[PDB]
């Protein structure tokens, strides 16, 4: 895993889920893909996605999200479950 307090950099591939969905649904699906991906790879029970990340996902409309995101992740412990917070790099 990765230890809390640390600032980690992740590249998320959205190319993958492109062409699974129709063009007009690509950005809303990219959001869910980001959440699932970071949960898997940070071993978190919750993910909180920053508004800046959402805005970068939706910059060019619903049809054209970026192919590769670079994101910063910080994990915190509270009450057991791990919580990951995502920002832009």
In the chain, which residue ranges form alpha helices assigned H by DSSP?
A: 26-42, 51-57
Window 1 to 40, contacts with RNA (CB under 7 A)? 1-2, 11, 13, 15-16, 19, 22-24, 28, 31-32, 35, 40
Distance CA 66, CA 14 (A): 7
Distance CA 41, CA 28 (A): 21
Minimum Å distance from CB 26 to RNA? 10
Whether 76 contacts 4, CB under 8 Å: yes
Window 54 to 83, contacts with RNA (CB under 7 A)? 54-55, 57-59, 61-62, 67-68
Per CB under 7 A, residues contacting RNA are: 1-2, 11, 13, 15-16, 19, 22-24, 28, 31-32, 35, 40-43, 47-51, 54-55, 57-59, 61-62, 67-68
């Amino acid at each position: 895993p990765i230890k809390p307090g640390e600032e980690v950099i992740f590249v998320v591939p959205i190319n993958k889920i492109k062409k699974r969905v129709p063009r007009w649904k690509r950005a809303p699906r990219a959001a869910r893909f980001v959440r699932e991906w970071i949960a898997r790879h940070a071993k978190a029970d919750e993910v909180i996605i920053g508004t800046d990340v959402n805005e970068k996902i939706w910059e060019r409309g619903a049809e054209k999200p970026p192919g590769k995101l670079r994101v910063k992740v910080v994990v915190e412990e509270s009450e057991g479950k791990r919580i990951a917070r995502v920002s832009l790099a």
